[PDB]
Amino acid sequence: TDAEAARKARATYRDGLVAPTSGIAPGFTQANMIVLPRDWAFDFLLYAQRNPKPCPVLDVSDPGSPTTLLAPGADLRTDLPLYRIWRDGKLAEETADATSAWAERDDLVAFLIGTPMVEAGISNVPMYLTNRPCRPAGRLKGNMVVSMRPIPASRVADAATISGRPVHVGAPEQIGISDLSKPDFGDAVRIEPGEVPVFWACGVTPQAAVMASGVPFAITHAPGHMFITDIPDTA
Amino acid sequence: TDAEAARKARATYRDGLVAPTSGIAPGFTQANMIVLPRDWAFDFLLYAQRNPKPCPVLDVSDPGSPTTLLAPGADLRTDLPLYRIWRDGKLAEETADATSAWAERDDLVAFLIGTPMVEAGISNVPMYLTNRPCRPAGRLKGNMVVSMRPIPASRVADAATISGRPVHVGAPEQIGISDLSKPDFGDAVRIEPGEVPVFWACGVTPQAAVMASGVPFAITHAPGHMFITDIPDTA
């Protein structure tokens, strides 16, 4: 509603207020970011279309253009709280501003991917590297990564039908997980009696893919620091 | 398609060929049956509207009329393979024809309630009496009953979103089940490693309700012997 005040958080991020995006501008879609050199653009788009579950694209920028239709007037170089510049497979840094690195390469292409449940009555979410590979696309391949969210045994279904508008459920060993204790990405959560490991797909997989494939240069958001769009979680 | 040949199975049941309805006329909706005296009609309808999940009504007959819009030209007195006449809370018999008992009371009202999954790649189903009560309605109350279907840990969600168009999942003790070994209704199934107890609501609950409430006279289908409608599982 009013559709604005999401443009107010982005505004605080230009000034340079690093911070998680959790709960902020609640109601408006929030996304992950992956920007690769043009010569890798086709491959990511293919990978994204071939693996819609773990790689749902909301918008792709025009080569070298840091803007998005998901939030007219924004700037992907400064509107996120924190970024991760990746060089030759590795992590080179973690700036609150990517203007500098965007200027490095001329034809850069960015992919925006990325509460109603809590309205029904239901750190960084523990994520695991599965044994379930994705469909390859050019130089891109790898197994999808998953996010574990402990759901009560009575709203798991209600978690399925509600979100529909989960990749795995229970049996963690069936996707190659022998202990929720050691997630593939730090953390660990308190999974109580009566709760159930519900797994999800997210922007880590597409990320882990480019990473493991030796992409020379890449820009991403820093975990927990997504790009808040002007799109209301209802379209 | 052709929408007929479901009227061919019903036809075999008039002759008197008791037998399960499993797999028959696949593609066409199949239902449970509950027929109570008029003076209980209002209560069941209320109970049914107040508990849509465990009591989904597809059609209600006009008092004393054994027909249904769900299959023009059928006769609820002879078109099911086997029936259960219930007298004063108890089970009085199990005939293949209910014509006789329908003639007993003048204003009888029948409720029709009641594969695509197996198209995705996914005895009598084990059912349990929970600890989760339904919303009462007049002389009707009681806890919903559930059906357990062992679903692979990768199609549980896919079992939720597919059927949407489950009441509980996992944690059986959270709904008052301390051992899937002894179902509330005989049977028992082989729940393998990597599978997950997925619970469902069905016509037993509405049945168990009328039963435990002392309804003098009632007619039902016999487990596994439903009424096959002319409605295709796609409307």
Swiss-Prot record, chains A, B:
Keywords: Lyase. The keyword Lyase applies. GO terms for molecular function: lyase activity. It comes from the Bacteria. Its EC number is 4.2.1.-. PANTHER family: D-GLUTAMATE CYCLASE, MITOCHONDRIAL. HAMAP family: Hydro_lyase (MF_01830). This is Putative hydro-lyase Atu3911. It comes from Agrobacterium fabrum (strain C58 / ATCC 33970).
